[PDB]
Amino acid sequence: AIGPVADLTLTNAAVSPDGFSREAVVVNGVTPAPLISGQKGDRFQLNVIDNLTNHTMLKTTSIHWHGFFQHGTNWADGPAFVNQCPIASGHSFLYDFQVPDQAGTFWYHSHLSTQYCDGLRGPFVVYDPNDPQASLYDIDNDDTVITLADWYHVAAKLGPRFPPGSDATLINGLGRSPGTTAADLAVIKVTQGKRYRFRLVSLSCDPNHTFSIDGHTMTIIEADSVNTQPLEVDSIQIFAAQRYSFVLDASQPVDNYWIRANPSFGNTGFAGGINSAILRYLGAPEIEPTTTQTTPTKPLTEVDLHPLTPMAVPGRPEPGGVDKPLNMVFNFNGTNFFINNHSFVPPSVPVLLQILSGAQAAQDLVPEGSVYVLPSNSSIEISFPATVNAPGAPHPFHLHGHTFAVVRSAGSSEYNYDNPIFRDVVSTGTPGDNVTIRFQTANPGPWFLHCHIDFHLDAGFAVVMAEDTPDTTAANPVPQAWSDLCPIYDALDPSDL
Amino acid sequence: AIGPVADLTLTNAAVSPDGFSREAVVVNGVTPAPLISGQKGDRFQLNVIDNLTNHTMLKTTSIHWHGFFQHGTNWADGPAFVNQCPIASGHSFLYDFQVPDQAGTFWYHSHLSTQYCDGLRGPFVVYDPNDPQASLYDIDNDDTVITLADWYHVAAKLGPRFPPGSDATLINGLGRSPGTTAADLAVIKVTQGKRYRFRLVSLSCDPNHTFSIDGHTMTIIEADSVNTQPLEVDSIQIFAAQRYSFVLDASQPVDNYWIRANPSFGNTGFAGGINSAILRYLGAPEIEPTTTQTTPTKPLTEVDLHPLTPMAVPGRPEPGGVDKPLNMVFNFNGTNFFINNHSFVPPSVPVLLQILSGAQAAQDLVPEGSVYVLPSNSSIEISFPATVNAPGAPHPFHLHGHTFAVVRSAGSSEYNYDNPIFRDVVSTGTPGDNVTIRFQTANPGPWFLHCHIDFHLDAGFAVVMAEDTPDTTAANPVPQAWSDLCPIYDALDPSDL
Ligand SMILES: *[C@@H]1O[C@H](CO)[C@@H](O[C@@H]2O[C@H](CO)[C@@H](O[C@H]3O[C@H](CO[C@H]4O[C@H](CO[C@H]5O[C@H](CO)[C@@H](O)[C@H](O)[C@@H]5O)[C@@H](O)[C@H](O)[C@@H]4O)[C@@H](O)[C@H](O)[C@@H]3O)[C@H](O)[C@H]2NC(C)=O)[C@H](O)[C@H]1NC(C)=O
Ligand SMILES: *[C@@H]1O[C@H](CO)[C@@H](O[C@@H]2O[C@H](CO)[C@@H](O[C@@H]3O[C@H](CO)[C@@H](O)[C@H](O)[C@@H]3O)[C@H](O)[C@H]2NC(C)=O)[C@H](O)[C@H]1NC(C)=O
Ligand SMILES: *[C@@H]1O[C@H](CO)[C@@H](O[C@@H]2O[C@H](CO)[C@@H](O[C@@H]3O[C@H](CO)[C@@H](O)[C@H](O)[C@@H]3O)[C@H](O)[C@H]2NC(C)=O)[C@H](O)[C@H]1NC(C)=O
Ligand SMILES: *[C@@H]1O[C@H](CO)[C@@H](O[C@@H]2O[C@H](CO)[C@@H](O)[C@H](O)[C@H]2NC(C)=O)[C@H](O)[C@H]1NC(C)=O
Ligand SMILES: *[C@@H]1O[C@H](CO)[C@@H](O[C@@H]2O[C@H](CO)[C@@H](O)[C@H](O)[C@H]2NC(C)=O)[C@H](O)[C@H]1NC(C)=O
Ligand SMILES: *[C@@H]1O[C@H](CO)[C@@H](O)[C@H](O)[C@H]1NC(C)=O
Ligand SMILES: [O-][O-]
Ligand SMILES: [O-][O-]
Ligand SMILES: [Cu+2]
Ligand SMILES: [Cu+2]
Ligand SMILES: [Cu+2]
């Protein structure tokens, strides 16, 4: 684990995670990217060095640190043409932020176009010296992090505009595809009698996965950086960008047990050990598990998660019971996504620089009709009604610089203004659902709100919430290197992007 | 091949044409519908028995017989609420018409709403005993018809109003989807040394297809039923509803060759064999081609197509050089297409039934704005300027009851007033283009004119061309069954439609 102070060098490289070679974006020579770590309070200083050659997979780049609030550091949040212009190949940039008030499981990925699918994605953990869940397990280290990635043989910009799911699911960077059914499976090693804190992270570009371990249960103590009442389950549906921590008691006989990560679509199931990995008890023979499935007895619902610490839902316990209640009407013209009749196109000047250059009203910011100005110390409610005119559902929408209350989850019709789970990524479900969320404006700056299916985002399924524009500039004091980015980016030839 | 006298029973069934099962509309047990055939001069007595049970995919129908002039049998043309009321479930209907003056390659398909998207669509060949280009091939039969079909895992009414292109492309009814990349492929047998009349038909709902056969070329002898000067090419961009006969000399070595049909959009490309089929020289092993495609050196341009028999352009060689010039200004409100400010809403009483009660004038026809009245025995020009205000480009517009001259094709400033190709479906191109057509009104009755992307037609992208309204009653005398459709249809419960 590198960090909290680290150099992250970005290069192109051939890799063979599913035993099939293709070019990718790597970070310090590996994909998924190396585990970054620190502890509650640390100031992370992450110097991103662009040494990318391949323009098909994009020579320019930008990094998001997913889940962190970035209070007073909105310039460092990452989304391209929202919070910065991209970094140029053969240049460096120093991400310099603090996490004073959060801990748990997160991740980092490129946030320019669809560049994370090509490889620039990985896990990021912030351990807590006073973790209230600490007594519940014995072991929590680098080898208890468990990553999920969907992996494509064709690059993002060479395949279809809406990839139909993955060739392989990579668990901790390895997996099989139906054409490479003898490729190495990842092995997660445990010692009988010990209790592990496994930190599951979706690095998915698109599909959600359904995580199961044969012969074992799983006790959720964390979701998306927020601790929960412990919750025993035997199946978890994790959407793109979500995280869980779950405790496992390696209290079964010493053997090999299939770990299972089935995607919503693409090459699907486990024939040949695709979408699989291996939980191996120390001392078991080095072979593939021959355990079988079971009908999950108690799968996870969001509705059953609750904050471990009481956390208060903003506003009044009735719908619309807030200062600024918004509705997101989705649509689609055959190629472009639309929220409230507007398809996000990135502006040529970033939204933060627009604010910092004085534009503060919604009509003076571009793209007009995709940027929503909000008041401070104000409760916000946002509703995401699920419709057939947004294909690719369920869409995991995500808000930046915030974690929010899920007053209504998918599958539920019950609202819950009392003890809902809070998080930064939520499935908006299917037609019937009106998945709905709440937060207060605690954090001046522009914050991207989009689907976290990267291909829908790329097709303009996004808005920016610019909050406290009059305070914003003072609150978010830009460093020099950041104001060099647009000047350097605008210089470039289009064949070096 | 069935016909020229045949029953077509319509039912709902589950089909797995790309190895994914879904409920659908079939015709004598199959989707695509069975090949109808006959010969120039034949009368067809096609008896349509409606036995549908699934309201979602519609319980009522019309069939249209695509590309037949239908002279004096305007009642048998199909378009619901233009030429007939729909047929009710539990009822029969006899389409009875003649083809004295045409030959070549046609198709049939539902012209109620988006019903043909759900499987009610198939090929229809009319062979010519004195075919002028028969000496250019050896074999021409059931087995040389080749249909292209966009397929969807979700039904037309259950999915998006404008879906994201196809999930698979069916070739003679078989295809693969990414995620069913092991499903059977269409295998099209050839014998080395023989020449074939392949009859390519787009049964597409929406996307166009860039068609190709590895290590073979293709001599176009027919477009949309009009015979043509032989034209050798190695790639054909066939638009929805268009047809081409082409000759293939099966004089490569005996092997398996990829047939390729890449859609305009959707599940794009060929990864895992999607959007493909197999040309299999008899004797070749029963396996996938390992051939590769190569940038086509002679892709077809419409402009290079010319009649085999001189067919003279109506009017005078100059824009507007005709007895009646029109121009369709496209427009689109975010759910609905408009032509000249009006977006087609079907009238309660069909446009033909309206004319038969004497409604001869533009003032007196519903829907008003969308019904254009044409003078008989006069030249007509219609121009279809492409515009950003009509997304979905390129839109393939179709005129019923006619073949027209393509005085200006897409991707061409130049106007051909001398020997341009004649057809019934044309790409109106991308903004910049002003594709334009001409025809004589020699055929009394209202003929539908619309974009043949069925989800656009359904969103209102249509106008009717009521020609010779005074003679229409006399020229198109009506059987009793036709008159009994409207009363039957208006009886129905809304849950039975
Ligand atoms: C769909 O929409 C409307 C119905 O609501 C129809 O628009 C009518 O079109 C008529 C065509 O005959 C038109 O008739 C008269 O006007 C034209 C000339 O109009 C043009 O110029 C005016 C003014 O343009 C100048 O001033 C404006 C600002 O005032 C400037 O922006 C501009 O740069 C310019 O200096 C325009 O308003 C107008 O759009 C035209 O460009 C005459 O030649 C005719 O003889 C006749 O008098 C009528 O004005 C329009 N009606 C309305 C209510 O706007 C439209 O036809 C319909 N579409 C179809 C296909 O049916
Ligand atoms: C820069 O990055 C891109 C994208 O990662 C690399 O694209 C690769 O390009 C090659 C050749 O164009 C592709 O290979 C071909 O695949 C077909 C099978 O479909 C096969 O018939 C050919 O023989 C060949 O193998 C390859 O698929 C593609 N890779 C990806 C991931 O899309 C490109 O190679 C990189 N540039 C350099 C200099 O490495
Ligand atoms: C009549 O035709 C319609 C449309 O063809 C059929 O609709 C089908 O409805 C089922 C559920 O009733 C759909 O399956 C479901 O999909 C969800 C994903 O949202 C998933 O949880 C499950 O896979 C679930 O089974 C199905 O997609 C849909 N089919 C199509 C083609 O859209 C209907 O079933 C037919 N009626 C009869 C009586 O057969
Ligand atoms: C989901 O809930 C939202 C609000 O919570 C609903 O949006 C309302 O729609 C009406 C339409 O008449 C608008 O006038 C209101 O402005 C909306 N309310 C708010 C608070 O913005 C929406 O209809 C619901 N959708 C579904 C499918 O249940
Ligand atoms: C497409 O071509 C047609 C003519 O072939 C154009 O229509 C004419 O436009 C001029 C001026 O705009 C008018 O004076 C005529 O009355 C129009 N004729 C008809 C029949 O409408 C049309 O404007 C062209 N459109 C584009 C975008 O090039
Ligand atoms: C989308 O545009 C249409 C027509 O322009 C409008 O009726 C609709 O309300 C718009 N959607 C919004 C603002 O949510
Ligand atoms: O993560 O956006
Ligand atoms: O097909 O009209
Ligand atoms: Cu390389
Ligand atoms: Cu993220
Ligand atoms: Cu984020």
Ligand SMILES: [Cu+2]
């Ligand atoms: Cu290995």
Ligand SMILES: [Cu+2]
């Ligand atoms: Cu999405």
Ligand SMILES: [Cu+2]
């Ligand atoms: Cu984001």
Ligand SMILES: [Cu+2]
């Ligand atoms: Cu059934």
Ligand SMILES: [Cu+2]
């Ligand atoms: Cu048709």
Ligand SMILES: [Cu+2]
């Ligand atoms: Cu037609």
Ligand SMILES: [Cu+2]
């Ligand atoms: Cu089969």
Ligand SMILES: [Cu+2]
């Ligand atoms: Cu169209």
Ligand SMILES: [Cu+2]
């Ligand atoms: Cu039609």
